[PDB]
Structure formats: C-alpha cells, structure tokens
Design an enzyme around this catalytic site. Structure first.
Site, PDB file in Angstrom:
ATOM      1  CG  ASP A 133      -9.612   5.470   4.019  1.00  0.00           C
ATOM      2  OD1 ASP A 133      -8.806   6.435   3.994  1.00  0.00           O
ATOM      3  OD2 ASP A 133      -9.173   4.270   4.055  1.00  0.00           O
ATOM      4  CG  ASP A 170      -2.352   1.009   0.500  1.00  0.00           C
ATOM      5  OD1 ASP A 170      -3.038   1.485   1.407  1.00  0.00           O
ATOM      6  OD2 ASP A 170      -2.520   1.213  -0.695  1.00  0.00           O
ATOM      7  CB  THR A 208      -2.934   9.678   2.183  1.00  0.00           C
ATOM      8  OG1 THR A 208      -3.452   8.390   1.742  1.00  0.00           O
ATOM      9  CG2 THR A 208      -3.862  10.416   3.215  1.00  0.00           C
ATOM     10  CB  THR A 209      -1.173   7.552  -2.379  1.00  0.00           C
ATOM     11  OG1 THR A 209      -1.290   6.605  -1.357  1.00  0.00           O
ATOM     12  CG2 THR A 209      -0.070   7.050  -3.357  1.00  0.00           C
TER      13      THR A 209
END
Lengths: 133, 201, 129, 73, 513, 72
Positions: free
Chosen positions: E381, E47, E80-81
């Site tokens: 989330d 992830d 976030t990524t």
C-alpha cells in the site's frame, strides 16, 4: 507478590471498587465517553455478585455490605483500612483479612481487564460479511 | 440460526445475526459463572456418550466444547490464551467479556468516530490499571502485619482441612527464603518448585 | 455439541435417573429380597439381586446412571461387598434432600450439610462398635 | 408422436421470435441501449456484446421458429 | 415485455442488498464471520479488501463487485474496498428514478455526466504535491501505513518506498510505473529491518544446497534446452533388464554431464535459469547437482513471473544446445548472489543488469512466515500511494471523505445544468453522504439517530471542511494527514460509473444454452 | 429539538458534575445550555406535584400481582 511491588485485593474485589470510581469519571467526561466507561464499569460489579451465589451468600447480601465502605471521599488507595476494598472469595462476604491467598496481585488483574475488553474489539474488527459457496 | 436463510455460514444480515451471536456468547459464560472462584462447582461434560470428564476450571471446560459460531470461537480462544499466559483469571475473563461484546456493538454503531468509542473503553481500563498500581492496602506480603508470616496464615485459614495457619504459616516463610536463586523478571523472585516438600504418614 | 440448561432443571433430571435404580435394590438388600427382571433386547431372561448387572447389559444414561456404575466397581475391588449398598445410599439422599432445599433456595448449604452428616455418622457408629 | 395444433403453433412462432428480437434491437440504430450478455449455463462469465452475431448465436434456440431466423440472418 | 422490467429491479435489489451487508467498512464495525461453506469447509475472514477479491458468487450482477476491486488495485492499489461501497450508492439512485419514469438509458448517460463534473471538482479542492519530490511523498506514505496494521514497522517502511518508485519513475503526470516493473518478492528470513531495495532485477526462486556463488561476474542464463547424454537425448545401445545394467547407464549418463557443465561455465555462467516446461525432463535432475559444483545457480519448473521480467528488462533471449555451444544472445550481468540471511532463504540477485530505465525489485523479509505477511501488505500500500502520484498527482481528503465533500459542490452544478440528467446526479450527491452512515448502521441497534447526524457535521463545515473519517471531529480535511492521492478517488468514481451502468443497459432475460 | 437523544443526555450530566448548574435540553430554543439563564422559568411546584404523584401511582401497580376479576 515479590515480582510486582504493587498489589490489590484480587479476584472480583478490585473490580467492585473500580465500578464506583469509573462511574464518577464517566459522568465527569460526558458525551459518548460517559456510556463507554459506564458500560465498562457495570460489568465489574457483576463478577463478585455471581461468585457470591456460588457459595450461596447471594448477590443481594454482597452489594449491600460492600458499596457502603466506598465513598466519595474514600476513593483513596491508602495502605490501611478505614474503608474496606478487599473481599474474601471463599467466605463470599467481605471480612477484614487483608492478606488472604484468595487475593491475587496486580500482574494477573491487569491482564484480566485487557482480555475482557479485547473480545469486544476483535468481534468488531471485521470489515465486510460474505457467504462463500 | 434465526432470520432468513437466504445466505448461510452465520449470515442472516440486519439485527437477527447480531442477536444470535450474543446469546451464544452468553451461554458459554453462564457455564463459567457457576464454576467461578475457588468456590467453583463441578460440571459434567459428556464427550461422546460413553465418556465423561469432571472439571471445574474455566478454560478447560471451554476447550472440549463444540464452537459453531464466530462469537463462540473467539471467546474460547480468549480463555485458552489466558490459560497459556498464567492460568489465573481464567474463570473470570469469560464472564466480563459476555456483557462487553453486546453493549459495545451498540455504542460503536452509535459512532461519532469508531476509534473514539473503543478508546473510551481503553480510558476506563487506563484509570483501572493506574489505581491497581497505586494500591498497597490489601495483599501486601512484604509490608504485612507479620510480612510473609501473616500472608501464609490467612491463606491456610481460607483453605482449612483441620487446624492450619498454625505450624503451616511458618512453612511458607521458610520455603521461599530457602531458595537463594534469584530470578530476575522484574524484581527478585524465587521458584517454589525448587523446594522439597515431603510426606510422612 | 453444546447443550445449555441451567439450575434446578438439570438437578431434577438427576433425581429422576438415580431413584428408579435405587428402589428395587432398596428391597434386594437385607435378609429379605426381590428380583430386578431385565427384558432383554435379544429376549430371554436375566434377573439379579444386583442393579449394576442389569444397567450394564442395557440402559446407560448421562447423569446418575453412569456415576452408579463407576463407584460400585471401585467398591468390588476394595472390600468386595456393599456394591449393592452404595447405589441406594446415593439415590435416597439426592431424592429427599434436593427438592425442599432448592424451593427454599440454597444449593451450596446442602453440600455443607453432607459434611456435617459425614462427621456425625463416623463418631456415633464407632461408639456402638 | 407429438402434435402441436393449429392456434398453438402460431403462438410459439410469435413469442419465441419476439424474445430473440428484443436482444439485437437495443444495439441497432444510433446509440441507445446495449446488450451485456449474461452467461451462466455454459460457463459463468459476463460478456460485453454489441455485435448481433455474438448475441444471437451464443444463446441457443429451443423454439423451433427461432432456429430458422438466426441461421438466415 | 415483462422480462425487462423484472430483471432490472431484482438485479439491482440483489447487488445492493449484498453491498448493504458489505458496507461495514473502516474501523471496527459489524460482527465477525466463521463461514460454513457450500462445500463444507471452515473459513474465517477479516478485512474488507481481502474479502471482496476472494468473494465467490454466481449472481451476474454481484460478480461486478468482485472484479471492480481488482481493477482498482492495478491503477491505484488504494481504495479497493472504497470503490465497491460507493458503487452501491449509484445502485440506490437507480430504483428511485425508475419509479419517477426516467428511462434506463437516460440513467446511464447521467453517470458519465456525474463523472466528468465530479473529477474536475476533485482536482479543484486538491493541493498539488510534486511527484518527484521526496518530502511530500514521505508524509503521504505515513498516512497509508498508519491506517494499516503497522504503527511501529511504519518507520522503516516510509523511506524505502520513496526510493523504490524513484528508480522506475518517469518525470510526467502521465501514466507510468506499475507493478509489472515493481517486482515484489518474499523471502523467509531477514526481519522488517533488513528488507532490501535492489535497484536492478532480483528474482525469487529456490537454489539447491548452500555453498554457491555469492560474488561478482555472471552471464545471466535464459535457456530452453534439454541435454544430450546416454539415455537422455543421445544414443545408447545398452538396454537394461537388471539393477546392475541400470547402474551402468546412469553412471555414464551423469559422467558426461560433469564435462558439459564446464562448457556452460566457459560462457561465464554463474546464473543459469532453466525453462518452465520440459522438452523431456529439461536439464536432468542429475545436471542440477553438477551445475551447483561449477558455481552455477538453478531453478527448474520456474514461475511465470520470472520469464516475463528477464526477457523484457535485461534483453535476455533463448540459446542453443551445449554440445552445439551457446548462441550468446544472453544479456549483461555482474552479480550471482544466493541470499542467505539468519540461516534461511535462497534467492538470485542480478546487479549490473541492463535496463530500459525501469524495473525495481524490493525484497520482503521476515523471520517467520506470518512476519513476512505483515511487512508485505503494508509495503504494498505504501509503494502504491507514491505510485499514484506519478500516474496523476495531487492530494485530496482521504478515507473517502471527499466523496462526502463532493456531494455539496455537485448538487449546485446539477441545478444549474438543468438537464434530464440533473435529477439523476442530484440524487447521487445525497447517496454519497450515506457512506459513513451505512457503514456504522449494521453493527448494532438504534440505527436512525446517528445516521442523520454524521451528514450534518460534514456538510456544515462547507466546501473546505467536515468530519474526519480517521479521527472524527469537524476540522479541515484537505491537509491534516487524512489525505489520499487524486488518483484514488477519481479512479474509484470512474470504475463504479462503468460497472453500474451496465446493469441498466440489458433488456430481457439472457442465458446461454 | 432534533438531536440524538442518548448523546445529549450524557452532556447535561457532565455539567452536573462540573458545576451542578441548570444544564438541560431546550425546545424553547432547540439547543442545549442553561435554562435559568434562558428564562425557561416555571414554578418549583409543578415538579413537586409530578414526583409525588408518579411514585404514588407506581407503588400500587408493582404491589398488585394477584388480580381477582369478576365478569359478573
């Protein structure tokens, strides 16, 4: 065999049949999916050939005899021989004994297919690559 | 490793690190190609340098091995997980897997969508499974030539130590049918270890 | 760790290891005999008509060498003689058979030839008994 | 003892003071460049600086001409 | 000098190169890492989000990437990524402009002007859903769940999230609702089915034995005091030098405490919660067993989180010693519940607490330690997506598809802007189009061909369509269930624009001595 | 024409398994479609010659694997 009514000539023999069929289907679909199935398909042909080598009957001898029986109008599953589909694995060349104990039913052979694919999905599953000091 | 060693722990970036991983994956598999089938060949794994074990089973071999790469690591565990399941398919599963992983990183990378590229692989297995279900041409012991008598005969001829399929075919028919305990796991089944098989010299 | 080397490459290493042991003991058996001299790592002399003794005191190798030590030990426990004999038979057969039949290309056929020579040998040797 | 001779002393005096100089010159005047001070030798952090006090003190002086000026200012 | 030129080129090289590696995001791409550390430990990662927060670097420019992810989680809790990869695009812009002879201060300015225009255009394409209306919230929550690991526990999770955030909410489009009010607790036992939303405040703690208050009526205890007893904080003249003499001192010590806990119960206590740090031993280890008897809850060596929440929400303030009697500045309460569920778990629920009109708590349950983990990420989330709407509403394309979409609309606005800044922003429009490209590139072999193609398919659809990034295929992207909040992509641009800008600003080497 | 070459090849095989038509790649338009109905018309004979010459050329090289050279 009692648990699952359905049966196949197991080992690499179900595999040898399926190579040709998943190729006829690959072509038909076209686009990106033609490659997806076609790489899947050629991987099925290789296992009974490698097995052959072990008993020293060789790859070349194996493919040659076997693909002939399969045809484009012998895609049938039947319930009796008119095209061969098994492959005795001790003999390492296709015979006409259609109930040998070198066959293994549907239960093991479905999960053989799923586990070989999973390995490609999983190594891929990562997002991001880092070194941690 | 190969490539730059600017970073470490199986990072070298670009083409090189992918190339490294797939070769290693292939080395495991090659061990199991020779050990494939009931025709499988003995290997010698030296475990220290004062110990040896002789094995010819696909999952077993891989357990003693020293993984040291992520590709190494996922592939042994796949074999061992299959060993836990049934313990059949164990020699084969590795060999198919070696080829698949190499081909796919190329095709997933050559995306229109990555979920679609993986789904094609799924589409091939879905036909396969369907086929597998449709078949009753070979390995049917319930609509055999002689039902369970023929199934056993051919099995004993394939694993022949003398003259067998004779007296020994009849045995197989008796032992399954001697247990009247049905074990409902999808259709009625019998244990083949509730039987008593005895040796006499 | 994992080391990968495949086929006929591995199979020569086996010949190499077995035959070197087999040769002097091939002279030591009979009613004529030789001596296999050990030069020890601590020095001094030990010399025997038996190859396993000398292997044990120093020199163990991965393929054949460990196999020859292990079969010969089972042999002592059994009859008590012929400890000498095993090692020679194992090395001469692997020496002579392997190379000509690998270049031709057929390993697994050779394994089946060993059976057919086992079957012959029991029958013919018992008739002369 | 160590003696750093007549040309060389003056050269150390010029480069040392120039380097420290270029840190506080960005913030000085109207909006132009700022300093974001990079800390790794005491502790590993980044710091958002705009005051000359923070910039000049936090980075040591190890060039002898440089010491005198940071104290007077 | 030569110190400013070379630092900017390398720092930009060094973040960007790591950002190239890192850009393998969305879906199954790149090849796994089993990581031999610089300290000799075996670590396995998957992830993109989890990696970036964890990432341990010492290159000043690369540290920016670690912390960029964390701010994003706190405002959005989404993307976030995403926020890192698009930041790597801005870095790609910075080199090409240095060669052209556009000065570094100018490239900073342009980032602001890129931000100002861009977010306004994001608001334009967006379809404005209501942040207090449940139906649209329910669809949006499905989008985030179905993009994570869950696909069957998704069913349970969508409705609990709409309810949870509803408790904390404030009507406005202004910044409200936080995870300083949304309290997230884990509990071993229960299942993902049994997860429970308590509208008040529930704290996560461990309570000794099973056999304690599970009924109504409680005075919630926030204490900062240690007992007075013999060989504690009260005088004894009995000095031990024997096992026997030791036995006496401890007996009289525990005895007086059995009396003491009755005065604690007189108050109404059915909950008492002990301070984190001792003033000798705090309430002794003997006191805790006696308290259990009165029917009164325990936790010594309390976590930090509980101390912050109790005081804020319920108004609960410290109280005087028990021999001196409690001061009664404690808040209101009416439930002391020890939550056991499928044979495991110890928990405190406080119901009938006073509130400021905020603060919900969700309890996260799972029959196995991994099964709790599976609920936990997914819910996080789903809570956060509905959250993002209150803070700033609307829905735009998801997966980072409007940053590709934004590129077309944005080139036009640069040309007509006709500044110094125009060239910097135009070049960034082309860089936002690389994000599905770069993602795929690293995985395999044959890079070039696919890379050009994904930019054609998205662009040609125009200002309202392109390729989807969660299904593929050229179809309408603005509403089709490939959505994310306005907040997620505006926030991502904003954070990126600040962190990157900072690399340009420095001059000359700097290293504290 | 400007495409991804491997993606394209596979789509033409699909219409050679769904009709056996004339689907191929155009540079005479820069698209993908039937070439007979696009008037991309050239003789049979260019293709007859090119196959037979390509096989003939091929067989010679794979057969030689023992080369004796003289730099005399």
């Amino acid at each position: 065999v009692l648990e699952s009514k359905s049966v196949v000539p197991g080992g690499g023999a179900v595999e040898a049949a399926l190579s040709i069929y998943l190729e006829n289907y690959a072509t038909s679909m076209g686009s990106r999916e033609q490659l997806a199935i076609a790489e899947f398909a050629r991987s099925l042909l290789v296992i009974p050939n490698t097995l052959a080598v072990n008993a020293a009957q060789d790859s070349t001898d194996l493919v040659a005899k076997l693909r002939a029986f399969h045809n484009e109008a012998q895609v049938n599953p039947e319930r009796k021989n008119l095209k061969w589909i098994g492959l005795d694995l001790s003999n390492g060349k296709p015979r006409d004994n259609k109930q040998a104990g070198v066959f293994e039913p549907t239960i093991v052979k479905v999960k053989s297919l799923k586990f070989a694919t999973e390995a490609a999905i999983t190594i891929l599953r990562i997002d991001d690559l880092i070194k941690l000091h | 490793m190969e490539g730059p060693l600017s970073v470490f722990g199986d990072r070298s970036t670009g083409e090189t690190i992918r190339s490294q991983n797939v070769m290693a994956a292939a080395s495991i598999a090659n061990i199991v190609k020779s050990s494939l089938g009931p025709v499988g060949l003995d290997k010698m794994l030296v475990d220290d340098i004062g110990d040896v074990t002789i094995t010819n089973d696909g999952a077993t071999i891989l357990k003693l091995l020293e993984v040291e790469h992520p590709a190494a690591k996922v592939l042994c565990e796949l074999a061992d997980l299959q060993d836990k399941e049934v313990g059949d398919g164990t020699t084969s599963v590795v060999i198919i897997a070696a080829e698949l992983l190499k081909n796919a990183d190329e095709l997933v990378k050559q995306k229109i969508h990555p979920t679609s590229v993986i789904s094609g692989y799924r589409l091939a297995c879905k036909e396969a499974v369907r086929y597998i279900n449709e078949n009753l041409i070979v390995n049917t012991d319930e609509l055999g030539r002689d039902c369970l008598i023929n199934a056993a005969k051919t099995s004993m001829s394939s694993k022949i130590i003398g003259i067998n399929g004779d007296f020994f075919a009849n045995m197989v028919v008796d032992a399954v049918l001697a247990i009247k305990y049905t074990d409902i796991r999808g259709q009625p089944r019998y244990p083949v270890n509730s039987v008593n098989i005895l040796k006499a010299h | 760790n994992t080391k990968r080397e495949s086929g006929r490459k591995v199979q020569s290493g086996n010949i190499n290891a077995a035959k070197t042991i087999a040769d002097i003991i091939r002279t030591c058996l009979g009613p004529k005999s030789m001596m296999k001299m050990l030069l020890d790592p601590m020095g001094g002399i030990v010399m025997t008509n038996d190859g396993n003794a000398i292997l044990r005191e120093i020199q163990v190798q991965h393929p054949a060498a460990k196999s020859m030590i292990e079969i010969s030990r089972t042999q002592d426990e059994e009859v008590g003689d012929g400890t000498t004999s095993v090692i020679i038979l194992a090395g001469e057969m692997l020496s002579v058979a392997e190379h000509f039949l690998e270049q031709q290309m057929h390993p697994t056929v050779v394994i089946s030839a060993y059976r057919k020579a086992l079957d012959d040998m029991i029958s013919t040797l018992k008739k002369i008994s | 003892a160590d003696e750093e001779r007549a040309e060389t002393a003056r050269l150390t005096s010029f480069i040392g003071a120039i380097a420290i100089g270029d840190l506080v010159k960005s913030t000085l005047g109207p909006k132009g460049m700022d300093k974001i001070l990079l800390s790794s030798g005491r502790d590993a952090s980044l710091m958002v600086t705009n005051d000359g006090a923070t910039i000049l003190k936090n980075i040591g002086v190890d060039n002898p001409a440089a010491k005198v000026l940071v104290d007077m200012s | 000098r030569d110190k400013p030129a070379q630092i900017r080129f390398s720092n930009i090289s060094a973040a960007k190169a790591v950002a190239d590696a890192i850009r393998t995001s969305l879906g199954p791409k790149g090849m796994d890492k089993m990581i031999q550390d610089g300290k000799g430990d075996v670590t396995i990662t998957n992830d993109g989000a989890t990696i970036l927060k964890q990432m341990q670097v010492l290159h000043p420019a690369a540290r920016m990437l670690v912390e960029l992810s964390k701010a994003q989680d706190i405002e959005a809790g989404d993307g976030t990524t995403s926020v890192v990869i698009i930041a790597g695009s801005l870095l790609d812009s910075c080199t090409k402009l240095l060669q052209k002879g556009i000065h570094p201060t100018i490239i900073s300015e342009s980032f602001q002007k890129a931000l100002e225009k861009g977010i306004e255009i994001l608001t334009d394409m967006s379809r404005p859903v209501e942040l207090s209306d449940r139906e649209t919230l329910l669809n949006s929550a499905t989008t985030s769940l179905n993009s994570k690991v869950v696909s069957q526990y998704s069913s349970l999770l969508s409705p609990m999230s709409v309810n949870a955030v509803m408790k904390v909410i404030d009507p406005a489009t202004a910044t409200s609702v936080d995870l300083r009010d949304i309290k997230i607790v884990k509990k071993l036992g229960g299942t993902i089915d049994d997860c429970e939303l308590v509208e008040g405040l529930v704290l996560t703690q461990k309570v000794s034995n099973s056999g304690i208050t599970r009924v109504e009526k409680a005075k919630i205890g926030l204490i900062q005091f240690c007992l007075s007893a013999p060989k504690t904080d009260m005088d004894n003249q009995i000095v031990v030098s024997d096992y026997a003499q030791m036995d006496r001192v401890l007996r009289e010590e525990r005895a007086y405490i059995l009396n003491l806990v009755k005065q604690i119960k007189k108050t109404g206590c059915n909950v008492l919660l002990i301070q984190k740090s001792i003033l000798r031993d705090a309430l002794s280890d003997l006191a805790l067993h006696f308290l259990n008897k009165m029917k009164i809850m325990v936790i010594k060596d309390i976590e930090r989180e509980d101390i912050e929440f109790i005081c804020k929400t319920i108004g609960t303030k410290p109280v005087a010693h028990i021999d001196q009697f409690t001061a009664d500045m404690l808040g209101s309460a009416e439930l002391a519940e020890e939550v056991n569920l499928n044979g495991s778990g110890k928990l405190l629920k406080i119901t009938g607490c006073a509130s400021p009109g905020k603060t919900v708590t969700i309890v996260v349950r799972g029959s196995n330690k991994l099964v709790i983990e599976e609920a936990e990420r997914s819910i996080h989330d789903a809570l956060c997506v509905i959250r993002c709407l209150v803070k700033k509403r609307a829905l735009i394309a998801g997966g980072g598809a409007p940053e590709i979409e934004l590129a077309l609309r944005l080139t036009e606005y640069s040309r007509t802007l006709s500044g110094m800044e125009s060239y910097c922003v135009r070049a960034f429009a082309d860089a936002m189009e690389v994000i599905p490209s770069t993602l795929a590139e690293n995985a395999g072999l044959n890079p070039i061909s696919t890379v050009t193609e994904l930019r054609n398919r998205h662009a040609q659809g125009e200002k309202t369509a392109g390729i989807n990034v969660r299904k593929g295929g050229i179809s309408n992207i603005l509403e089709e269930l490939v959505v994310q909040p306005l907040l997620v992509s505006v926030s991502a641009l904003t954070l990126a624009t600040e962190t990157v800008r900072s690399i340009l600003k420095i001059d000359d080497v700097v290293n504290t001595r | 024409a400007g495409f991804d070459a491997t993606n394209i090849l596979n789509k033409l095989r699909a219409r050679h398994a769904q009709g056996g038509t004339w689907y191929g790649v155009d540079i005479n338009n820069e698209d993908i479609a039937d070439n007979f109905e696009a008037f991309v018309w050239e003789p049979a004979m260019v293709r007859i010659n090119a196959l037979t010459a390509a096989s003939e050329a091929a067989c010679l090289i794979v057969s030689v694997d023992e080369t004796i050279k003289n730099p005399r």
